[PDB]
Give the backbone structure.
Amino acid sequence: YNVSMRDLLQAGAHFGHQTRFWNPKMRQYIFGARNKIHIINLEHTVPALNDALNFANQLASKKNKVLFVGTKRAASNIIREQAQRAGQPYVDHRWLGGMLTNWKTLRQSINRLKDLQTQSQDGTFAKLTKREALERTREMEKLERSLGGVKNMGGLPDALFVIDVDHEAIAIKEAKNLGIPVIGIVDTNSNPDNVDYVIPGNDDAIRAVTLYASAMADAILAGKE
RNA sequence: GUCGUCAGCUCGUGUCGUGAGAUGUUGGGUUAAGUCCCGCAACGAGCGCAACCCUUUUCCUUACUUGCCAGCAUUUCGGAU
């Protein structure tokens, strides 16, 4: 499930943000600047990505659960589809404040969503009249877009795989608080201090995020033990 | 009694701060209303608002006296009979 380097180049992982938006903590990876934007070399990307894939594969072999976090508009559909393929918990919409550090309260949310979903599955919704049907149905819609991804999830995850560390800094902080390891895609304008497995690469390209999520999901499925 | 029928007043877990505290309850529309809908380190609850109670406006069913009189008949022309 390794990515080689040519696939990374075709995806476009080598691009970064403009030089004036950089974070000086990525000097080791930034390599050079072809234009007014930085170019992240894939020579450091490939091995770190391979270690991340190996770690996730070992976690899947041990049967641990790896949560997926991407909330950008570009990466939302990709994380949704790939996490559905991999059968692991996912967070598509905005990170709720206290999803992990305040899991006890989110549990009740999962429970009443399941309850009202079973109500819709059975005939209680049918005997509920039309206007009651309608506000309970948008109750469905909002709660499902809010926490549908973590509905199967019943405990704290063993790893957190994140698309944009800056865009999802809150999740990284909660993971640091609870001690759970983080694998994340960091870019030139990003802070890598609280990421245990730091893979450097592009984050805006839909090809790049698709490649990353494909590698992650294929490793998780390839656990097979 | 009064502010005043004013729309406000609080609580638990989680975060930020050495701390008193803060957040949530703020931000944009809307409403008679913290009324409702969107966003957001917050996620969840109660008392308040509204409704449930009484009365009035249209119709139906049951009930036909001590109340009623459209049709019939008799009338001292008084539903008087």
In short: Chain A has nine helices and seven strands. Residues 96-147 of chain A form one domain. Strands of chain A lie at 15-18, 37-39, 66-69, 90-91, 159-162, 182-186, 197-200.
